[PDB]
Coordinates of C-alpha atoms and ligand atoms in Angstrom, one line a residue:
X1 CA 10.6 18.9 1.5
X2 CA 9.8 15.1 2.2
X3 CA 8.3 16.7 5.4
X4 CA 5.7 18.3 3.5
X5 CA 5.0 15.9 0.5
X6 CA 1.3 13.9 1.4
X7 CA 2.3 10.0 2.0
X8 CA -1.7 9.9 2.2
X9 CA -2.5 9.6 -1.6
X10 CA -1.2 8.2 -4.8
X11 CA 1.1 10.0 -6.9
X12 CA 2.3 10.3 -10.6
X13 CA 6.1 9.0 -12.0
X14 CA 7.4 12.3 -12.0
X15 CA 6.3 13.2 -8.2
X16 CA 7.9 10.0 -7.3
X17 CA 11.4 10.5 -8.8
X18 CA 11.2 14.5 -7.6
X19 CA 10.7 13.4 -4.1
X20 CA 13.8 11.2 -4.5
X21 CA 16.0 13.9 -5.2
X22 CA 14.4 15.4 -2.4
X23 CA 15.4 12.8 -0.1
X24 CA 18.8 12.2 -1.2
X25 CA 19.3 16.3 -0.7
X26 CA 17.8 16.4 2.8
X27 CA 19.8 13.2 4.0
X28 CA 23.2 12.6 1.7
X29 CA 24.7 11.2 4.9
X30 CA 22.8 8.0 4.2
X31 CA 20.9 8.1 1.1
X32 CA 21.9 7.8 -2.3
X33 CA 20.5 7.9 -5.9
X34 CA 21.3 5.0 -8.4
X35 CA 20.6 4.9 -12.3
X36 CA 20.7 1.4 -12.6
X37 CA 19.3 0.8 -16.4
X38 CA 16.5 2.7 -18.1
X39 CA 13.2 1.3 -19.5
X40 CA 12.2 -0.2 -22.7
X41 CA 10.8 3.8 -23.7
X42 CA 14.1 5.0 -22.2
X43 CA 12.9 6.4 -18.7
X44 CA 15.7 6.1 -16.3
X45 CA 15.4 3.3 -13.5
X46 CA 16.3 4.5 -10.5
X47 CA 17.4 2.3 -6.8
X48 CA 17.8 4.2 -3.3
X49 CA 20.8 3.1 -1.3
X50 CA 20.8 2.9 2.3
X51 CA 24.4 2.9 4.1
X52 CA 26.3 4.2 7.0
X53 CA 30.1 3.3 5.0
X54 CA 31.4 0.2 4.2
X55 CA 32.7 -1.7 1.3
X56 CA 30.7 -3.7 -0.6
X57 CA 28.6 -4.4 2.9
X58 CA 25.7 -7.7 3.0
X59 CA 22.4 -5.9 1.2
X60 CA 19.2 -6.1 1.3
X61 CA 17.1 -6.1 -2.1
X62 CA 13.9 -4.6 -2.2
X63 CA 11.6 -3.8 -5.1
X64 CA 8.2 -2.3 -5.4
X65 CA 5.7 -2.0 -8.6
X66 CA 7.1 -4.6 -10.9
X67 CA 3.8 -5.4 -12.1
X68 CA 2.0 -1.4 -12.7
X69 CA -1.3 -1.3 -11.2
X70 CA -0.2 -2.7 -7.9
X71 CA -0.3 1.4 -6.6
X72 CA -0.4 0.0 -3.1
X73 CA 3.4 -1.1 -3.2
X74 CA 4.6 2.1 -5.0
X75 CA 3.1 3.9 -2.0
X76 CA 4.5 1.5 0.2
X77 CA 8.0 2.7 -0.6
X78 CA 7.9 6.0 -0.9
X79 CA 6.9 5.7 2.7
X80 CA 9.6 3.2 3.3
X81 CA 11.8 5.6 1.9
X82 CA 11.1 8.3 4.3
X83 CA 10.9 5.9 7.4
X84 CA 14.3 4.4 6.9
X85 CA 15.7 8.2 7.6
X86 CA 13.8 8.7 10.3
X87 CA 14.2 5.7 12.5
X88 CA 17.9 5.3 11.9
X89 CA 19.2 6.7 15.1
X90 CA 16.2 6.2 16.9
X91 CA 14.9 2.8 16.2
X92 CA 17.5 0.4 18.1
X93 CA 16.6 -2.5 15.8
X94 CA 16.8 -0.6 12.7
X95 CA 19.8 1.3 13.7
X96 CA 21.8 -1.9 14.4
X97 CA 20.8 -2.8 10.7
X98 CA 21.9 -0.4 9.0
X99 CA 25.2 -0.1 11.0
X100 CA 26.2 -3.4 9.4
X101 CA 24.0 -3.5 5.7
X102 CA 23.3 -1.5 2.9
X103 CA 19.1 -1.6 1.8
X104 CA 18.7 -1.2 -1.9
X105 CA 14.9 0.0 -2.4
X106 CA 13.3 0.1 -5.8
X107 CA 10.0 1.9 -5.8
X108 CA 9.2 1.8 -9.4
X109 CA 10.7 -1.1 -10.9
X110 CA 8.5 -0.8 -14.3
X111 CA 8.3 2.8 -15.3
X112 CA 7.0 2.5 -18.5
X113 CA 3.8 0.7 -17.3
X114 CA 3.2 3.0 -14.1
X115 CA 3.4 5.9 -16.4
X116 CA 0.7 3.7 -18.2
X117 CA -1.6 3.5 -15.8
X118 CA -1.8 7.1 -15.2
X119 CA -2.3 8.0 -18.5
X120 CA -4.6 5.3 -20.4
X121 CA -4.8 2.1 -18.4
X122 CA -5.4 1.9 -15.0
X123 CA -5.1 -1.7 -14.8
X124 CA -1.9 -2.8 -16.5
X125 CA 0.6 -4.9 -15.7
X126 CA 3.1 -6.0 -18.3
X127 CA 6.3 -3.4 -19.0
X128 CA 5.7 -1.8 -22.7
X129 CA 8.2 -3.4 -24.6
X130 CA 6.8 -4.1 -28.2
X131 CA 7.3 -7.3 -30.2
X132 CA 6.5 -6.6 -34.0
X133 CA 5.1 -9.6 -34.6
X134 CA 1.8 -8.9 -32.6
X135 CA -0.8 -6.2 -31.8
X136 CA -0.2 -7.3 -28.2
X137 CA 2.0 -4.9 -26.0
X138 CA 4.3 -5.8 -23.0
X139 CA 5.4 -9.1 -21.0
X140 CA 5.0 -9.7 -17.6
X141 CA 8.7 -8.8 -15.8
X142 CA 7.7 -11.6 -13.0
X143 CA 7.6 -14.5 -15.6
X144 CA 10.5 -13.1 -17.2
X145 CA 13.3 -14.5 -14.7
X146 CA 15.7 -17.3 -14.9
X147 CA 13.7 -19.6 -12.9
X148 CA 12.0 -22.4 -14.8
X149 CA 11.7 -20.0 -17.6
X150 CA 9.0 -20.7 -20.1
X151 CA 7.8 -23.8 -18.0
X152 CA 4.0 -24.1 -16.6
X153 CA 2.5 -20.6 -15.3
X154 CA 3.0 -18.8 -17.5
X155 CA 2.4 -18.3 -21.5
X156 CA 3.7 -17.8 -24.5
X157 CA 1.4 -15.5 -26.3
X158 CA 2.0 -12.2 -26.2
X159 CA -1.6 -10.7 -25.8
X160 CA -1.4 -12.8 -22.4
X161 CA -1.3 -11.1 -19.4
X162 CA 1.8 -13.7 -17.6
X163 CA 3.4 -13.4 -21.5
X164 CA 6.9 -14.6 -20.3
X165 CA 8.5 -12.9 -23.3
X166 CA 10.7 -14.2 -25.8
X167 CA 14.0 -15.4 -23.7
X168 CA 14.4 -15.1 -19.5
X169 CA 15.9 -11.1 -19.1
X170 CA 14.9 -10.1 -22.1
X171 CA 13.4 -7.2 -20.7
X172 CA 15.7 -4.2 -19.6
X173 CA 13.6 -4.2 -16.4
X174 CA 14.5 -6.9 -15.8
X175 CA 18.0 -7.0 -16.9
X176 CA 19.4 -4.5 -15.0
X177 CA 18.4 -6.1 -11.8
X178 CA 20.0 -9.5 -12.6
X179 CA 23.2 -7.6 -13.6
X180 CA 23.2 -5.0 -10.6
X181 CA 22.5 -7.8 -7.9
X182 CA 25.0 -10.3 -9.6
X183 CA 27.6 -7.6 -9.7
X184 CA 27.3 -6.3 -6.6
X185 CA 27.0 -10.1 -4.9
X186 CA 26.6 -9.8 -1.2
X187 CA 22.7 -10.0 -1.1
X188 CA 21.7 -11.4 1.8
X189 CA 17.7 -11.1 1.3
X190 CA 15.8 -10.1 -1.7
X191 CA 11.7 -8.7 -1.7
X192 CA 9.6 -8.4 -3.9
X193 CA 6.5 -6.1 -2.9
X194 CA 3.4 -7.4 -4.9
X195 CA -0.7 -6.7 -4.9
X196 CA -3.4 -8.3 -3.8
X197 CA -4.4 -11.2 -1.5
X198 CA -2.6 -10.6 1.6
X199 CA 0.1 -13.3 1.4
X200 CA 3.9 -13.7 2.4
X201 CA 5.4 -16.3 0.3
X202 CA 9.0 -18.2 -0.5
X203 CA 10.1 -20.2 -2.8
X204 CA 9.5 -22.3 -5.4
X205 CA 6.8 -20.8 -7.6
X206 CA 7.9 -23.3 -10.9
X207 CA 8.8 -26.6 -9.0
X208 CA 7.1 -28.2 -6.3
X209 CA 10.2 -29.1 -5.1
X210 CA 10.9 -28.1 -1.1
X211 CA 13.8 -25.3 -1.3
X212 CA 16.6 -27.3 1.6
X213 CA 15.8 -24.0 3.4
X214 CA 12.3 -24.5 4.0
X215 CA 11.5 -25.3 7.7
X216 CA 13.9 -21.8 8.4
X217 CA 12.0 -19.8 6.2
X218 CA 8.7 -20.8 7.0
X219 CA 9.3 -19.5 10.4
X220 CA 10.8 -16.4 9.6
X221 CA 7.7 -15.7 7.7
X222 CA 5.6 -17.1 10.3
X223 CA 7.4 -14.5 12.5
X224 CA 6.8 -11.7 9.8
X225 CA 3.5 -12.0 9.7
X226 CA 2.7 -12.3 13.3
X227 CA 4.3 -8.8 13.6
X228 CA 2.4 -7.5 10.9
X229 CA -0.8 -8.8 12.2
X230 CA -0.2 -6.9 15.7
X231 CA -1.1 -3.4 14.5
X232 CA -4.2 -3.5 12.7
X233 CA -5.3 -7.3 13.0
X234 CA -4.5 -7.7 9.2
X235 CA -3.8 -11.6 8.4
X236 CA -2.1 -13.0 5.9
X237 CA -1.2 -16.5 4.8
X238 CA 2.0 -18.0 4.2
X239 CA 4.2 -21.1 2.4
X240 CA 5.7 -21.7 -0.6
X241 CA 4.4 -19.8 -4.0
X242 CA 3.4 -23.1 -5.4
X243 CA 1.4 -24.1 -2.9
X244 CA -0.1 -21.3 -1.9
X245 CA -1.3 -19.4 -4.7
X246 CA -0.5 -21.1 -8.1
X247 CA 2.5 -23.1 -9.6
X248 CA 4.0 -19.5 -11.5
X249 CA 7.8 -19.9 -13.2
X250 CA 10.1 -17.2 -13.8
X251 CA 9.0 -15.4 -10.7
X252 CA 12.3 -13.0 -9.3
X253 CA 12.8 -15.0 -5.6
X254 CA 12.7 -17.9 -7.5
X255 CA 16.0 -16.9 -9.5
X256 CA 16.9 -15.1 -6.5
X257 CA 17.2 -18.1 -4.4
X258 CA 19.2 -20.0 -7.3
X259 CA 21.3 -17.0 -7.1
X260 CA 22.4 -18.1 -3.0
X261 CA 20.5 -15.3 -1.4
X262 CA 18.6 -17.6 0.9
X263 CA 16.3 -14.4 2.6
X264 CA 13.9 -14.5 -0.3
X265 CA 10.1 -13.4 0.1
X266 CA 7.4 -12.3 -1.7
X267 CA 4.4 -9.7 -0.3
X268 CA 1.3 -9.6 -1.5
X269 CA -0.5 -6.8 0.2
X270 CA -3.9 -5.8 1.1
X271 CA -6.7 -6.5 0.1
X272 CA -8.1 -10.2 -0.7
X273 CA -10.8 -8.8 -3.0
X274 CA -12.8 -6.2 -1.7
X275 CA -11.3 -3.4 -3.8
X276 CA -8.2 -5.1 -4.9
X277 CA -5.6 -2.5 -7.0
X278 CA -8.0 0.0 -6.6
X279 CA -7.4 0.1 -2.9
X280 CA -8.7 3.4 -1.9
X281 CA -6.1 6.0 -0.8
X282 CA -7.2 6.1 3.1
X283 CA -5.4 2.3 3.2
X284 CA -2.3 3.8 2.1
X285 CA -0.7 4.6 5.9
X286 CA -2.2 1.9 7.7
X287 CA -0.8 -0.8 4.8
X288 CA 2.7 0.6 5.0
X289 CA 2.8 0.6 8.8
X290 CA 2.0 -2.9 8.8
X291 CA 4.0 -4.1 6.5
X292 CA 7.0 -2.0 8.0
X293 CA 7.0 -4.3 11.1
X294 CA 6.6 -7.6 8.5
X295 CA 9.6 -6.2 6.7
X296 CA 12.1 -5.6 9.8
X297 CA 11.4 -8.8 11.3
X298 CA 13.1 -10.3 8.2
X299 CA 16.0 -8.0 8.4
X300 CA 16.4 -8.8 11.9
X301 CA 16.6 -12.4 10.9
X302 CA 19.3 -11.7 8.2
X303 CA 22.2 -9.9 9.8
X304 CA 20.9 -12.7 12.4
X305 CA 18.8 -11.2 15.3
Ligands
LIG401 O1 0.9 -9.5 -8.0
LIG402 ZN1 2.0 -8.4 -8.8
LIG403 ZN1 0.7 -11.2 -7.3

């Protein structure tokens, strides 16, 4: 049961997509199981839907693990997963949320390379698509987007570790995504869950251009942050990607934001350094706790309050 699986440590791909089927069996009255695409090695991708009824109801996008060896974000939503059935019903905010949106949560958004860094390569981060023309394996799903693609930030050669890949969605990560949220078309916000440095970011990452929604999302994630802060003391820093970390193009809220969904952030969890994507499994809890409360205050803002 989801009541007995240990939130409190890593676990492997297959442990991962058993306990969704766990989840979906224990609480079918408002979770649901998704095959949206399958991976470049043909492992199926899989998105959890959150919903009380509706037709095609405002969503919320959220995806964990693009980039492998970020364990802390996997984690993160398995326990996300689990907390989203308990506090419906009991947690008024929360409740009120999902009485009027649908969450989409995608806890392993690059299969191929989690199952890689369990099995010889703890710290990779591209997907494993292979390009016959090198020795080089994978590009780097978060240069792969339709934002400023193949512009500064990010390179060309395929040994690099930002490779951007031959065209923008060439990757069937990547692809199905694009296609799912374009289809579906009433996303409201879209997250991406990233590791390390402790950071809450919006867009641009290519342009350093000001998005015309700027000054309201600088104070939603000024919000976010102060409620992530009030647990544990944990503080992050926040702006726009290109300013606060590095100019990056074909990053996923970039396109996201082209795309009209206006709620678009980007978390880079804990640490800053210390023990970076090895953070140790005691962190685990505390880190999605925190970030729980970061999280809601951004759906609050987006079925607005
Ligand atoms: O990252
Ligand atoms: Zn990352
Ligand atoms: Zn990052």
């Amino acid at each position: 049961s989801t009541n007995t699986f240990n939130y409190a440590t890593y676990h492997t791909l297959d442990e991962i997509y058993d306990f969704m089927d766990l989840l979906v069996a224990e609480h079918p009255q408002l979770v649901s199981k998704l095959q949206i695409g399958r991976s470049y090695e043909g492992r199926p991708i899989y998105v959890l839907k959150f919903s009380t009824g509706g037709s095609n109801r405002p969503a919320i996008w959220i995806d964990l693990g693009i980039h492998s060896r970020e364990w802390i974000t996997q984690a993160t939503g398995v326990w996300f997963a689990k907390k989203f059935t308990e506090d419906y019903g009991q947690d008024p905010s929360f409740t009120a949320i999902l009485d009027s949106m649908d969450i989409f949560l995608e806890i392993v958004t690059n299969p191929d390379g989690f199952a890689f860094t369990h099995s010889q390569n703890r710290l990779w981060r591209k997907t494993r698509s292979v390009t016959s023309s090198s020795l080089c394996v994978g590009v780097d799903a978060n240069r792969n987007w339709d934002a400023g693609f193949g512009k500064a930030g990010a390179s060309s050669s395929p040994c690099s570790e930002t490779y951007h890949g031959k065209y923008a969605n060439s990757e069937v990560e990547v692809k199905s995504i694009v296609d799912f949220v374009k289809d579906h078309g009433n996303f409201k916000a879209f997250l991406s869950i990233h590791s390390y440095s402790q950071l809450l970011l919006y867009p641009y990452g290519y342009t350093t251009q000001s998005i015309p929604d700027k000054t309201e999302l600088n104070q939603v994630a000024k919000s976010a942050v102060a409620a992530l802060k009030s647990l544990y003391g944990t503080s992050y820093k926040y702006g726009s990607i290109i300013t606060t970390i590095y100019q990056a193009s074909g990053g996923s809220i970039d396109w996201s934001y082209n795309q009209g969904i206006k709620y678009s952030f980007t978390f880079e969890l804990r640490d800053t350094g210390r023990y970076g994507f090895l953070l140790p499994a005691s962190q685990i809890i505390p880190t999605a706790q925190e970030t729980w409360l970061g999280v809601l205050t951004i759906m609050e803002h987006t079925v607005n309050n």
